Design a protein around this ligand. Structure first.
Ligand SMILES: Nc1ncnc2c1ncn2[C@@H]1O[C@H](COP(=O)(O)OP(=O)(O)OP(=O)(O)O)[C@@H](O)[C@H]1O
Ligand SMILES: Nc1ncnc2c1ncn2[C@@H]1O[C@H](COP(=O)(O)OP(=O)(O)OP(=O)(O)O)[C@@H](O)[C@H]1O
Ligand SMILES: [Mg+2]
Ligand SMILES: [Mg+2]
Lengths: 745, 270, 91, 86, 222
């Protein structure tokens, strides 16, 4: 134990006395286990007849480590020897939480195949102990649909299944249960989020914020010492009042306001009317119908897209959006088409519905379909089939991409064609090699753009430092624009990959700063988009100050992207400081219509849903990635790579892709009969509880509120009292509480 | 003509002072020497490797004019020598400010890019070019002699063991000035902020200042000692000014303990 | 069975009725008759409702079998503000 | 009385109090007391609970806090002198 | 303990890497108020140093022959001097008024830019830039008092349209009084937290000054 002990300290313990290991000391057995791992790495296949005593040593060391609360040290031993499998055999009821927590905290850094190995091992430990909600969370992290189905139907507790259904509905994952399953109706309704609108409205009534907000109350022009202005104000009205169902400006007679906008503004403004009716399909379509019959070309298609916006995030058994939008995907007018595919994509995002995809796919190949229409179709079909690796969508997107001429690919709408392709394989990983080989035949510089986009989307939210190294190598060689388009995609990809875990994101912030410092305009025109993607709905002061330093940038595109990133970073946070900065920018950019429009967009985002909504793609304590939210954010941010022509041009409706990422920052405690149940809870900044044993506090700087409270980014919530037991450890979204038998004993 | 509009919100400097700056590496948990801490450290290391390679490449193909030492030399040339010390009177714009030199003459000059613009507040000492008076820096103000006067540089040698019979008093003062710093988790878990203020009263010689010395011995916070009679000044408004500056210095060195000894002497003595 | 269709229909939450409710009718009838009997069977005004069958808008003129309706099919009811002819005449 | 009960609820919101704290009784026990005295009562009840190495403050702790703050410290109260000025 | 050696190895590597990065990028000085080199626009700094001339701050005193096409402006350049100058070609004649601060060049002292009035830095710092962490929900037992305060100090600013229509002039002053600890400053902090207009906190003891008439000067500038 004292000197190096290379193949020695193990050897004599192996050949000598084989009595109980702990009889020779905790430090000695720790050294012995370290040596066991070291020599296990050395041993080859032919030395399989050398591990006979080693298995006995590990089978005795693991219970010893768990006996003296050294569970984490035990975990490393089986991790190094790649034999974590037997761990589940020796887990006791006093340590399953700690070992599972440590193994899950480790998974964000170990690469494949140890990623899935650790994930499945912790899943098995949870399943053995009947901890169904966390097992379902863990399987969702594994995107194993068969395992999701098995976990859901294995549990016999109806209430636990209801909570798991709530988690699945929040994640955007849906299951087709059998009618033989008890409580099929309510379980399906929970998983379809049909009650999301009513729950949100009940919260808002409880949180007395039902009053509509005019964009003037956000602008606050009375404290300050056009078609674009009207369009920006309609966007602000849609964002602030999102999913509320009431507005003083469009829910009233909005024809004067709606016609106050001109050209494609009427496209977004009418579509904005669908944002206030988000998740309220039944009531929302009742207001869309009036504008569905408008003679003006823009109004009808704007209402068509508002239909899908209204239906976005909620799965209706009788598909309304498909019915209202099917008859306009091959319309002669490109605007009616444009609205229809985008609405259909928003409505059925993350569904992989073969009927919708078959209805939508020939639109891309239609001769009358313009490049804008083809890009919109690609974005939609990607959003329906996000992370599904759909063969049909991949094949047709490849056909559309290689059918276009080289001069046709110069258009930036073609940039949306790989994105949907990338959306198809979002988070899949190494399933793109065939796709990359297919893309190799595409002409350049569009080939580099497409390859970067699909590769990043494949490695989205993985933290693979190798892919980040490749992206930084792409960003390294700068070109004295046309050839350098994919550099912005690589900059966005650094964020798209590093967003998985906190350490990687904070590390990548410095890299983004260096890219902004040394990079070319096209290189630095995407750093704000990367900052927005990596810190969406998370208004930490470092990113806000970094973006503010470049808000008044010499490059107009950098300024626009920085302002929009400031809006996205504090999106839905209702941050007072960020509101003050945006007001100051509006005063500063008063004479610049583009910068003022971006400032108004940022102001609208900052008060998204009156501060009750978030665009963050990560839920379940920032461990579960929502593929639909990632798809929407990716759509908006990649479209912002050409903010001059797409956002500030005629295609600002793409901002409604953010609708795919809108979720309520929620904590609603339900009874076992799904009625609301106000409970005292403590909300405070989350504290990492890996390592330190015993009971460490998981929240710092907390306050006690009644349960219908909004959780900020990084804010955990723990039940203040012990009267109720939560069905799931994660107190986010809709949580069911059960009366504690121990309480009031 | 229209007045310039600043892009910064407010007119005061950034509240944060003396941070780790660019060395703010993410806090890796757990501190225990486990494989997860090992993996987090490796991840930080890989990000640093990627950053190092990228920066080396960029500086490699950067022009000879644009180099770190070359840009620093150009900054020195732009500042020139000598660098006059003026007073930031007003921030007209992001890159424009009214500054007054030591001779009392004001100038509407331009703030250059390399100036730390978050260090600029009205009344702060700025460094200006000798010829064009353009703001070229912000002078880190030296510690005031009064700052030295309050601050107790060396902890007193009197400890709690040197105090006899004041068990309850020691407990009460520890619950307010020592326990909140050593064990804040008690207060956080109880949901109460610690007792705000403490006054020690009693007949002369009973050990009030001795207990304050014992607190100053075993405190990790900056200790400022002020006698009440020191708050009586010779000029109007100088007393309130001294109190305001004492608590400003207390705020600067947070966490801190302000010991206003013999407070009654402000009123009992004329 | 015997040419009668079990159409499960969805009602708006404003009409606080059983959302899982069933309608029974022929298929030789057309969308007009189906809309009228849907309005009658759950206390609704016929002039302000749109009907959704088979994920398609209910064409009123065409009869059910030629529409594409089948057994155990899902139906959806949309409350309307301003009638179709009145909305069209509005501007 | 209603205002004092409301202040007690405000300052003891994040407290780890017991289940049956009679805040109305505590408000009745300090007839003429400022909100600062009520905040100090809550803080001293928490301090009494902490000193006994308890994670939950009982009603007895609040009663001792009232005795220490409202009664014992009443010599130094600024209230009786200052309501002649107001 | 088995990872301790590798922990220290990678930690020392990280520290050396951080030092190496700081070698190429920057982060140094910080005593002469130098910004990080990522914000150094040196070419623009040189162009500003050449093109943008310094301007001495003076005060206009009298405009002679303002009606005609040759108006002469008497300026008082602080402690420097007094001059009779003319406006530059880039300043409108109506943009300069008697008694206002202007900025002039150092060669012919022609008025180049009208300037904001001089305000004492102590007065400037009195305006609140970080709103307090107290809302109206943290004040109990003051329902009527809070309502009366809000309908004077907050409601007219938030919704002035409700007052102008009825020819109503809202009160422009509120005095909160009561025994110590009753919540006067707490309600003021709540107002400052909820307000959107400029909030200035003045403590009466801050208006006491050493010299005669200085406190009145601070009030006037406030
Ligand atoms: N209870 C005590 N135990 C031990 N030493 C004590 C005690 N009380 C006083 N002393 C000694 O008396 C010395 C002087 O007392 P000290 O200055 O602390 O008293 P004080 O109550 O603060 O008086 P004053 O009102 O005059 O400021 C201390 O330095 C200490 O050595
Ligand atoms: N009505 C109240 N509701 C809740 N807490 C209160 C109330 N009144 C006072 N407090 C508490 O007591 C403290 C007393 O401080 P505060 O600033 O309100 O006093 P004040 O009335 O300004 O006193 P002084 O006249 O001495 O300046 C507050 O910080 C708050 O924590
Ligand atoms: Mg003394
Ligand atoms: Mg006060």
């Amino acid at each position: 134990m004292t000197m190096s002990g290379e193949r020695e300290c193990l050897k004599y313990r192996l050949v000598g006395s084989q009595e109980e290991l702990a009889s020779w000391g905790h430090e000695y057995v720790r050294h012995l286990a370290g040596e066991v791992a070291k020599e296990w790495q050395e041993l080859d296949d032919a030395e399989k007849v050398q591990r006979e005593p080693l298995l006995t040593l590990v089978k005795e060391i693991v219970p010893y480590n768990m006996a003296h609360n050294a569970e984490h040290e035990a975990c490393d031993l089986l991790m190094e020897i790649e034999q974590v499998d037997m761990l589940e055999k020796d887990i006791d009821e006093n340590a399953y939480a700690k070992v599972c927590l440590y193994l899950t905290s480790c998974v964000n850094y170990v690469p494949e195949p140890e990623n899935s190995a650790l994930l499945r091992c912790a899943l098995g430990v949870f399943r053995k102990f009947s901890r169904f909600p966390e097992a379902l969370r863990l399987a969702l992290m594994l995107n194993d649909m068969e395992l999701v189905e098995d976990i859901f139907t294995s549990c016999k507790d109806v209430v636990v299944q209801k909570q798991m259904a709530f988690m699945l509905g929040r994640h955007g994952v849906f299951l087709e249960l059998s009618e033989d399953v008890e409580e099929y109706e309510d379980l399906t309704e929970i998983m379809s989020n049909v009650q999301l609108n009513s729950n949100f409205l009940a919260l808002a009534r409880e949180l007395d914020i039902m009053e509509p907000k005019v964009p003037d109350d956000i602008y606050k022009t009375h404290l300050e010492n056009s078609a674009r202005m009207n369009l920006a104000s309609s966007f602000v009205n849609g964002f602030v009042n999102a999913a509320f169902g009431q507005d003083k400006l469009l829910t009233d007679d909005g024809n004067k306001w709606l016609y106050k906008n001109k050209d494609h503004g009427m496209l977004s403004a009418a579509a904005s009317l669908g944002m206030i009716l988000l998740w309220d399909v039944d009531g929302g379509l009742t207001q869309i119908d009036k504008y569905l019959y408008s003679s003006e070309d823009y109004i009808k298609s704007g209402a068509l897209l508002a239909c899908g916006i209204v239906n976005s995030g909620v799965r209706n058994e009788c598909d309304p959006a498909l019915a209202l939008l099917s008859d306009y995907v091959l319309h002669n007018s490109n605007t009616m088409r444009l609205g229809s595919i985008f609405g259909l994509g928003l409505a059925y995002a993350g569904s992989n519905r073969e009927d919708v995809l078959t209805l939508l796919l020939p639109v891309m190949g239609d001769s009358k379909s313009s490049m804008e229409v083809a890009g919109v179709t690609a974005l939609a079909c990607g959003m329906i089939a996000v992370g599904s690796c759909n063969g049909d969508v991949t094949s047709t997107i490849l056909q559309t991409i290689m059918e276009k001429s080289e001069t046709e690919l110069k258009d930036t709408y073609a940039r949306w064609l790989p994105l949907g392709l990338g959306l198809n394989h979002l988070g899949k990983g190494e399933a793109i090699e065939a796709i990359l080989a297919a893309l190799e035949v595409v002409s350049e510089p569009f080939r580099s753009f497409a390859n970067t986009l699909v590769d990043v989307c494949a490695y989205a939210g993985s933290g693979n430092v190798l892919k980040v190294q490749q992206l930084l190598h792409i960003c390294s060689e700068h070109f004295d624009a046309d050839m350098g388009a994919h550099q912005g995609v690589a900059v966005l990809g650094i964020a798209l990959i590093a967003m998985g875990e906190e350490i990687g994101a904070e590390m990548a912030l410095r890299t983004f700063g260096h890219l902004l410092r040394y990079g070319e305009p096209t290189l630095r025109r995407a750093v704000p988009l990367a900052l927005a993607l990596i810190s969406v709905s998370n208004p930490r002061l470092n990113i806000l100050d970094t973006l503010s330093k470049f808000s008044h940038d010499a490059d107009p595109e950098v300024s626009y992207n920085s302002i929009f990133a400031m809006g996205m970073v504090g999106s839905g946070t209702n941050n007072a400081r960020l509101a003050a900065m945006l007001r100051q920018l509006a005063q500063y950019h008063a004479k610049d219509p583009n910068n003022l429009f971006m400032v108004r967009l940022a102001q609208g985002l900052t008060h998204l849903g009156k501060g009750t909504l978030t665009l963050c793609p990560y839920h379940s304590d920032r461990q579960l990635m929502s593929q639909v939210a990632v798809a929407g954010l990716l759509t908006v941010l990649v479209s912002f790579l050409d903010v001059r022509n797409i956002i500030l041009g005629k295609s600002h409706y793409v901002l409604y892709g953010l609708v795919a990422a809108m979720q309520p920052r929620m904590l609603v405690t339900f009874d076992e009969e799904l009625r609301p149940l106000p409970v005292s809870v403590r909300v405070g900044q989350a504290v990492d509880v890996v390592g330190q044993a015993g009971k460490p506090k998981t929240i710092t700087g907390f306050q006690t509120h009644t349960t219908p409270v909004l959780l900020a980014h990084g804010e955990r919530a723990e039940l203040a009292t012990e009267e109720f037991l939560p069905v799931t450890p994660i107190l986010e979204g809709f949580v069911i509480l059960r009366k504690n038998p121990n309480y009031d004993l | 003509y229209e007045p310039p509009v600043p892009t910064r919100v407010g007119k005061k400097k950034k509240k944060t002072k003396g941070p780790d700056a660019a060395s703010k590496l993410p806090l890796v948990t757990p501190h225990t020497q486990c494989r997860l801490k090992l993996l987090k450290l490796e991840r930080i290391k890989d990000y640093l490797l990627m950053e190092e390679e990228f920066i080396r490449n960029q500086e490699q193909m950067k022009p000879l004019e644009e180099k770190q030492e070359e840009e620093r030399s150009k900054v020195d040339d732009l500042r020139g020598t000598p660098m006059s010390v003026g007073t930031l009177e007003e921030i007209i714009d992001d890159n424009h400010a009214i500054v007054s030199t030591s001779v009392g003459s004001e100038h509407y000059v331009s703030i250059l890019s390399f100036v730390d613009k978050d260090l600029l507040e009205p009344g702060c000492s700025v460094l200006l070019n000798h010829k064009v008076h353009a703001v070229i820096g912000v002078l880190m103000d030296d510690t005031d002699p009064l700052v030295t006067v309050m601050k107790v540089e060396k902890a007193p040698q009197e400890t709690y063991a040197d105090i006899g019979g004041l068990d309850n008093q020691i407990q009460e003062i520890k619950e307010s000035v020592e326990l909140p710093l050593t064990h804040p988790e008690y207060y956080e878990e109880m949901g109460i902020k610690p007792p705000k203020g403490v006054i020690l009263y009693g007949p002369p010689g009973t050990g009030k200042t001795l207990l304050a010395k014992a607190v100053a011995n075993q405190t990790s916070a900056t200790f400022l000692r002020v006698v009440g009679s020191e708050l009586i000044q010779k000029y109007l408004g100088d007393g309130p000014k001294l109190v305001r500056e004492l608590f400003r210095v207390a705020e600067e060195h947070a966490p801190s303990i302000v010991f206003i000894d013999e407070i009654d002497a402000i009123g009992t003595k004329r | 069975t015997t040419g009668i269709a079990t159409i499960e229909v969805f009602l708006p939450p404003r009409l606080k009725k059983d959302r899982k409710n069933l309608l029974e009718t022929r298929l030789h009838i057309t969308g007009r008759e189906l809309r009228s009997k849907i309005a009658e069977t759950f206390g609704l005004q016929e002039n302000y409702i749109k009907i959704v069958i088979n994920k398609k808008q209910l064409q009123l003129g065409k009869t059910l079998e030629e529409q594409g309706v089948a057994h155990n099919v899902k139906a959806m009811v949309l409350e309307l503000k301003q009638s179709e002819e009145d909305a069209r005449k509005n501007f | 009385l209603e205002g004092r009960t409301h202040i007690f609820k405000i300052h003891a919101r994040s407290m780890s109090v017991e289940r049956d704290i009679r805040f109305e009784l505590l408000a009745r026990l300090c007839p003429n007391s400022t909100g600062a005295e009520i905040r100090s009562v809550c803080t001293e009840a928490g301090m009494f609970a902490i000193r006994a190495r308890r994670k939950i403050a009982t009603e007895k702790d609040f009663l001792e806090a009232v005795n220490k703050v409202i009664k014992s410290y009443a010599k130094f109260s600024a209230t009786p002198r200052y309501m002649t000025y107001n | 303990s088995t990872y301790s050696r590798q922990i220290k190895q990678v930690e020392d590597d990280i520290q050396q890497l951080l030092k190496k990065i700081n070698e190429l990028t920057g982060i140094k000085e910080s005593d002469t108020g130098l910004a990080p080199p990522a914000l150094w626009d040196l070419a623009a700094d040189k162009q500003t140093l050449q093109s943008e001339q310094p301007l001495q701050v003076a005060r206009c005193t009298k405009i002679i022959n303002a009606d005609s096409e040759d108006p002469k402006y008497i300026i008082n350049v602080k402690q420097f001097a007094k001059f009779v100058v003319d406006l530059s070609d880039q300043v409108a004649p109506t943009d300069i008024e008697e008694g206002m601060r202007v900025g002039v060049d150092r060669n012919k002292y022609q008025i180049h830019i009208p300037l904001p009035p001089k305000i004492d830095p102590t007065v400037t710092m009195m305006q609140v830039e970080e709103k307090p962490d107290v809302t109206y929900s943290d004040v109990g037992g003051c329902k009527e008092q809070i309502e009366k305060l809000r309908e004077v100090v907050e409601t007219p600013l938030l919704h002035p349209e409700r007052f102008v229509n009825l020819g109503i002039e809202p009160p422009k002053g509120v005095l909160l009084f009561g025994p110590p600890g009753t919540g006067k400053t707490l309600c003021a902090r709540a107002v400052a937290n909820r307000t959107d207009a400029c909030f200035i906190r003045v403590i009466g003891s801050e208006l006491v000054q050493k010299y005669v008439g200085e406190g009145a000067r601070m009030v006037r500038e406030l």
